[PDB]
Amino acid sequence: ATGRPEWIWLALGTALMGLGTLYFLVKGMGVSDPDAKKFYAITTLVPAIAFTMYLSMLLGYGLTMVPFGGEQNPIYWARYADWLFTTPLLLLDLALLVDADQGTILALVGADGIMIGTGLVGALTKVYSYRFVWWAISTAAMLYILYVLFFGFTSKAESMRPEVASTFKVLRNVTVVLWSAYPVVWLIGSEGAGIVPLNIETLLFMVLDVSAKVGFGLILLRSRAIFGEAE
Ligand SMILES: CCCCCCCC/C=C/CCCCCCCC(=O)OC[C@H](O)CO
Ligand SMILES: CCCCCCCC/C=C\CCCCCCCC(=O)OC[C@H](O)CO
Ligand SMILES: CCCCCCCC/C=C\CCCCCCCC(=O)OC[C@H](O)CO
Ligand SMILES: CCCCCCCC/C=C\CCCCCCCC(=O)OC[C@H](O)CO
Ligand SMILES: *C\C=C(C)/C=C/C=C(C)/C=C/C1=C(C)CCCC1(C)C
Numbered sequence: 001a002t003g004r005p006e007w008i009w010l011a012l013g014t015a016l017m018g019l020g021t022l023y024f025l026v027k028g029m030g031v032s033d034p035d036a037k038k039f040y041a042i043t044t045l046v047p048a049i050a051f052t053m054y055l056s057m058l059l060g061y062g063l064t065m066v067p068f069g070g071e072q073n074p075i076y077w078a079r080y081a082d083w084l085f086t087t088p089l090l091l092l093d094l095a096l097l098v099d100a101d102q103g104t105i106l107a108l109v110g111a112d113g114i115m116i117g118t119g120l121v122g123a124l125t126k127v128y129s130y131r132f133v134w135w136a137i138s139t140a141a142m143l144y145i146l147y148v149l150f151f152g153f154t155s156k157a158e159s160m161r162p163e164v165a166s167t168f169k170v171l172r173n174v175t176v177v178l179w180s181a182y183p184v185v186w187l188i189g190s191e192g193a194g195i196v197p198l199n200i201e202t203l204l205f206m207v208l209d210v211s212a213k214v215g216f217g218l219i220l221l222r223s224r225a226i227f228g229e230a231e
Contacts, residue, residue, distance in 0.1 A: 005199040013122075020213070020217065049085050057076050068127070072196060077120070084117075095153070100156070114141045177214045182205075
């Protein structure tokens, strides 16, 4: 409904995830290389899931009211349903690019699950001061992920094919900068201190989400690093 001022950004987000899904879908037709097919499958699913959850927030299904600080506070819980399934897939794109081992993949996906899950608990907590305890644990799990992407993945990438290493380093830098903004927006927005209003908070997440999913995919899927070395 248009009674919520943030609706314009939810509608724009819905449209851009939908167009991004359609573009990757058609671009992925004809790809027969089995390696490339993995990356197209992982990367096309990411905006498709986000499309459905931006639509649920636009129509009002993905919104709940949570009492804290005396007031009833609108909390879009569908963001966490979105991020639970899309953030592991983005990490898989990076780990498959560098041929990460299985133990490291499991550690990354597990820390990511702890990240989003404790962020969800913090979003729905009724005692104000406890919301920030959960924010801190979630941020600690994120810092572990960022550490592994630098001091574990970067070291191996330098020992692989040059195009793999070069594409990895670009996507790593994009991920580190964009993921690090998310905890800041939560802390000063309606889920945390309440300094920035919800309509502006929704704009900022919309720009971060499209850049981290559609922009990330455009860089990856235009690279030759996703094809096997063939003659
Ligand atoms: C790829 C090309 C596209 C480039 C696009 C990049 C733009 C990102 C914008 C961000 C935040 C905008 C923040 C706007 C803040 C307005 C809030 C305000 O000023 O409200 C006044 C208030 O009533 C009294 O303080
Ligand atoms: C206006 C359009 C709105 C947005 C569109 C609606 C999205 C939700 C619907 C469908 C899922 C469609 C398929 C998603 C799975 C794609 C996976 C893929 O492309 O895999 C390629 C691989 O190479 C194969 O082996
Ligand atoms: C490789 C793995 C691929 C993973 C593919 C999975 C994508 C699932 C997508 C979307 C719908 C999300 C639906 C979430 C359901 C929430 C419904 C609910 O619990 O509502 C409670 C209550 O009724 C109201 O507050
Ligand atoms: C690498 C990724 C880093 C992610 C983790 C970085 C955490 C730092 C955040 C916040 C302290 C900001 C102030 C919190 C106190 C809010 C009360 C207040 O002073 O109001 C705000 C003021 O108006 C305007 O700064
Ligand atoms: C879909 C796009 C991406 C990059 C999503 C990123 C989400 C996070 C980095 C979440 C961060 C949080 C932390 C670490 C602190 C509490 C709140 C969050 C769950 C938003």
